[PDB]
Amino acid sequence: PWIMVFLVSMALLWAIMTMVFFLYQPRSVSSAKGFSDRTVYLNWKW
């Protein structure tokens, strides 16, 4: 049954591929230190 073995093995290898694809830890370490310098004071007239 080499044809069914080939099809089941490749379907399982693709299933393992899409299991690993969603195996990640989303690290929300987006620091907001840029806003400490984004604000600019109003320029005067000289």
Added chain:
Amino acid sequence: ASKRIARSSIDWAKMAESVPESQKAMYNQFKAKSDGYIRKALSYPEQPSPINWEHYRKSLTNPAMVDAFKKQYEALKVPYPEDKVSSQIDAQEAEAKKEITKFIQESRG
């Protein structure tokens, strides 16, 4: 007099509490250049030396010239100089008010 020349100024203490140094380094000029207009204000009074007409009456045989010069000095009064920068400063003030209103609105947002 010497009121609005010798014995008056603007409070610089609240001025230095906002300026972000390198952003407003012209304040270092503004505190200094206006100080030049204070330095010449150390000089230049209204009457720098009153004229002792009695001394010239005693030192001259004919005091009629002294009385004539005293009358001419009293008959001449210099008024305050003309100004044409007031409207320019008012226009700059109005533009500053509009920009401050816009900046306050952006700060509120």
